[PDB]
Amino acid sequence: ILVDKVFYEKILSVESFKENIITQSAIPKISNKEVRLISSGSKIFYAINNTSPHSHVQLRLNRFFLSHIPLNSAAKAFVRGGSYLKYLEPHIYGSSYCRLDISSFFNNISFDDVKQSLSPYIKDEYLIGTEQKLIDAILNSVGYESPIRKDKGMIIPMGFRTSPAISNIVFRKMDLLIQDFCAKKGVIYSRYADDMLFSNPRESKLLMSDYFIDEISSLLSIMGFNINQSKYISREKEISINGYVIENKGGNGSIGTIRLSKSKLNTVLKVTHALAQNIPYKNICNKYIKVRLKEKNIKYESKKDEFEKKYYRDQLINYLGGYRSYLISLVKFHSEYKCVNSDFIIQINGILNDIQNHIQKIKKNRRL
Amino acid sequence: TIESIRVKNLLSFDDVILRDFRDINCIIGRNNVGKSNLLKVIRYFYAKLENKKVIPLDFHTNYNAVGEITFTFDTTRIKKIVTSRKNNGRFHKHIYNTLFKSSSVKLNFEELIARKNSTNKSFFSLTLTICKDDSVMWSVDDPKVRSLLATLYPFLYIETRHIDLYDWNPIWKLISNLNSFNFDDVDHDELVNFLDEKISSRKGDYKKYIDRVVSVIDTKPYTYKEKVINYIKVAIKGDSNKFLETLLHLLITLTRTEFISPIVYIDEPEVGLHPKLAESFVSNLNKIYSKFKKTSELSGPGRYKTPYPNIFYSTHSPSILKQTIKLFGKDQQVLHFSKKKDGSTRVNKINSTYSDERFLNIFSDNEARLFFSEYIVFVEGATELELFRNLSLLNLYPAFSLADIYDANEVILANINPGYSKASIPFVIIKDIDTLIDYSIKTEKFSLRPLFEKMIKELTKEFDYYDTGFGRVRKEIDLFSDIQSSTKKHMDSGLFFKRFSLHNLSSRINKVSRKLNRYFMTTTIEGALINEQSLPYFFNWIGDVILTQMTINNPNPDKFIEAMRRRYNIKSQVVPLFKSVFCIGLNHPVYSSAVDKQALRIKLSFLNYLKRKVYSDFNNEKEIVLALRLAFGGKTETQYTLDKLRKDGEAELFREKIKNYKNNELFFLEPQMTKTSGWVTTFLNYTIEKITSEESDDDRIRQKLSFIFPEIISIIEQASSSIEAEESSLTG
DNA sequence: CAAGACCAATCTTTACACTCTGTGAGTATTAAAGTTACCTATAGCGCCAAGTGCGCAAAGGATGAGCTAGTTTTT
RNA sequence: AGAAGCUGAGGAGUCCAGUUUGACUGGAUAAGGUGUUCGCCAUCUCUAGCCUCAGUAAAAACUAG
């Protein structure tokens, strides 16, 4: 794709910035009065106003522009058809497993790297007179000058709509380099967001050596990225990643299996047990699940003891339906690839039957 | 016995996986490039297995750096053979040391017993990786494993378009590799002595002759394969379709006593063959397949339980597919390749197993032709075929001619199950509104058919979370459930509706059921053919029929016309004169100028009388349309026909008037009034010819056809748009 | 803490300049035709003006109604 | 250096350890058992292992039989 002046005049900016084009005025940047500063632990999330000229431009860029630039198959995050299960699937054929993480992935993306990556797909011309270029005008809708990070200048912040696509486009080069490095060693490599998973099917201690870490660090130093030394895992014949267990006993032509730990399913089992023991829905929805109806959210008093009950029932049924959808997604993944343990399949079939029975009982009780 | 083949980032493949192989796997599709690429991938993998220097394949995209080919082998029978305590041989122990040694020494004493020795299936996975610098890597770094896998699972490829009948190399290759004899125990000297003894006048002459020949022709010694081929040739008594039949029969026969399971690919088995020849080929293959089957009571010598090899077919003939589906049944599958939106080969399975024995026995060439299509239109009656297959109508729309129309009932649709191959073969099911709602006259209430209830149940989705835009479907379902009573009022003695129009409900149900690939017409085919805007054309067609088809029965036209004019009144008794003078005949004689003028005057008088009676008896001009579309086996508004009204005993006056019209004046039109008579084709051709004469531009005639016939033109336009949307993917 | 290893495609080819029509020794030296040339597309619902919008979210009758929202990963 | 760590603010009861006669500080309830590459890991069984208030942005896959 090659975006020209008319494309930005009609498609990218149909009505938001049409006033600034005929008047021959430069496109303004995003001011500090239009972005929120949500905080979560040691993380800062930037939220833009839902009614702003830049939000519509970002959505149009995401749908029409940042969806056709080719990517690398090793990236399985924020891409249509990608999933965590597809991120774990290729490593079932390996006997040794290694995991790596990138420290401050979004905060360390250089803006000039983004500009260079997006330059070939944008025509080199002046959008507004002889003062502002088309590339700069497009790029002013994705960056932000962080008041807390003025030392680093302006960066692409997490919480915007166009950040993941830009991250994938920027990191395509590093993905290609790492894949080329791993191909010669016979190591399967996959990436989800900023997490890298490496699998070795042969009997060797390459993944447990410091040489692999040094090589990955040297590769990542071209674009200024660093690894996190507190999240380095290297094991053999079994690995656990956020409750997903991948096992392979070893041997020539051996196929591993993927299952879920018991701790991964602990909350749903507790909810099912509480529901089968006739526990009030308020306690179930407040203790196990983190859903609570604050009194401030109430707008009109009207009637009191009829909306809380239906709200809690809807939240419970939505939670159960979502977890059922997750389990049947696992079942569909098994049907497509056949890399799931049989006993786990029996267990999840029983759990699905129990969940469906509980949902039917909840619906019948609500109707009565 | 391969189970899975996976190709990633090679040629025209992004990520393609093929599994669940059967014995008679068949490959069909429009994208031949995909089939060629799959064949090339398989041949490249098997050439790299045997350590041959070949050019690496190309990449689909250059934004990656690897291309992987993965093969899975079902090593279950070999494991059972080797691990048995009864078999003590060099080859068995070598196979165990090569295949099952590494994977078994890493297990404890619990998984080996009672966990992998009861019903488990053993798999062996081999991966081949091609890098950006044309480098080839294996997942297992042991040539012995690759050699053993190659010699245990051989691959054979047959091309029938370019095949030399003078070369029997595949036959000898199959014979040499499927024998259980050690030919190294036959000493050369003793055989030469035996031959010399058999033919000689003096002892030793043959041996001396052979020695003299060898001393001059001294070359490289025979290999083992050459020796066994020579022994087979001296043992046997002699040496396109016949070659393929012999290869298949030998492959089936020789593998009954061996643990080697070959894989065979055949390209175009029907090139330059009569359809009967292809059917006989498939039938003979099936008979030989069933001869060596030992199942249940079928036992005795010559019958085995050894698994059969895998065979792949690449065909473009519906006859072979029909025979394979009818004969093999559950031991076959059909594959469809097609493309994607951006351009990439796919692989899908088309349903070919049917639980109805009648459908399998009545299977014909139309069902097989349904496979080789890109857009299928399913209809119920035979009038839809006559309407949608008109040549003149399809001449103006070169986009609906790429779709095939099939007559299917509910049971036929259930057996075919078009929903399985939805992404490969798009389809649309066209039905009538009567199949969902039934109306009654004695009781003023609608009723819902079981099909409507099934559709509502399918649309209803329990065990779900909230989603914006899904509550409208629930509201529509609730309205459909609550419209069960729907008290209304019918005027003209249960003939019309007060204000329902059956149009808003039809539009709403069409919008709801568009996701299920269904379309419910407001009226029947005859209702759409003749509407309020098509009365002039229908009248012109009737007038042309009267002018042309009606001829004088008597051989002398002038005398008969004069006698009947002097006998019957020209104005009051015009109907008896028309009945007793003009008759329908295939041949139309040419009369004299005066006779032609008299006949034209009589025909014009008859036309004037009929039009005056039509416009006088009926006034609103809508009852005319109702009577016309009801006399041609149709129902309108209330969903009632002649027989249904007669059984219900309603609208006596209207039925009596229609009977009088049929049996008094339109006696000649009666033969062209029953279902499946042929009036649809004639009317369509006449209308198209008239509009073509009136308007020259294609856009003008298309617009006029759309104005005259809204519903069928709308259906054709929607189908054409759907075809154009998916034209790029379903086209090679 | 620094570090070799810094993507693919960006449209595709093809080709001497002069005055001499056969020969050329720059402190830093591609470019102009031809043939193409690609597609992006929409969200709650209903209504009347029929998509460029307006109203409303109580019916209804132009600003009381009433008013939830899945799992997991990255983070 | 560098890197994490963390959605926070708390409160009641109880236990342990320390100072200290009188109060403070630090650690703690998705329990118990088994095996472990010792990992914030895996597996098994219950009767399912405390409460209050603030905050919650973005992109993908999943509604099967």
Swiss-Prot record, chain A:
GO terms for biological process: defense response to virus. Keywords: Antiviral defense, Magnesium, Metal-binding, Nucleotidyltransferase, RNA-binding, RNA-directed DNA polymerase, Transferase. SUPFAM superfamilies: DNA/RNA polymerases. Its EC number is 2.7.7.49. It catalyses: DNA(n) + a 2'-deoxyribonucleoside 5'-triphosphate = DNA(n+1) + diphosphate. It holds the Pfam family RVT_1. Mg(2+) binds at residues 101, 194-195. GO terms for molecular function: metal ion binding; RNA binding; RNA-directed DNA polymerase activity. It comes from the Bacteria. Residues 19-246 form the Reverse transcriptase domain. It is an enzyme of class 2 (transferase). Belongs to the bacterial reverse transcriptase family. Reverse transcriptase (RT) component of antiviral defense system retron Eco8, composed of this RT, the following endonuclease and a non-coding RNA (ncRNA) encoded between them. Expression of retron Eco8 confers protection against bacteriophages T4, T6, T7 and SECphi4, SECphi6 and SECphi18. At multiplicity of infection (MOI) of 0.02 cultures slow growth when infected with SECphi4 but do not collapse, at MOI 2 cultures collapse. Responsible for synthesis of msDNA (a branched molecule with RNA linked by a 2',5'-phosphodiester bond to ssDNA). This is Retron Eco8 reverse transcriptase.
From Swiss-Prot, chain B:
A divalent metal cation 1 binds at residues 380, 432, 434. Residues 173-242 are annotated as: Dimerization domain. Its EC number is 3.1.-.-. The keyword ATP-binding applies. Keywords: Antiviral defense, ATP-binding, Hydrolase, Metal-binding, Nuclease, Nucleotide-binding. InterPro entries: ATPase_AAA_core, Bact_Antivir_Def_Nuclease, P-loop_NTPase. A divalent metal cation 2 binds at residues 384, 605, 623. Probably binds 2 metal cations. Residues 243-372 are annotated as: ATPase domain C-terminus. Residues 373-686 are annotated as: Toprim domain. It comes from the Bacteria. GO terms for biological process: defense response to virus. GO terms for molecular function: ATP binding; ATP hydrolysis activity; metal ion binding; nuclease activity. It is an enzyme of class 3 (hydrolase). ATP binds at residues 32-36. Residues 1-172 are annotated as: ATPase domain N-terminus. Its cofactor is a divalent metal cation. Probable nuclease member of antiviral defense system retron Eco8, composed of an reverse transcriptase (RT), this nuclease and a non-coding RNA (ncRNA) encoded between them. Expression of retron Eco8 confers protection against bacteriophages T4, T6, T7 and SECphi4, SECphi6 and SECphi18. At multiplicity of infection (MOI) of 0.02 cultures slow growth when infected with SECphi4 but do not collapse, at MOI 2 cultures collapse. When the retron is cloned in another E.coli strain synthesizes msDNA (a branched RNA linked by a 2',5'-phosphodiester bond to a single-stranded DNA). Belongs to the class 1 OLD nuclease family. This is Retron Eco8 OLD nuclease. It comes from Escherichia coli. The lineage of its organism: Bacteria, Pseudomonadati, Pseudomonadota, Gammaproteobacteria, Enterobacterales. The gene is old.
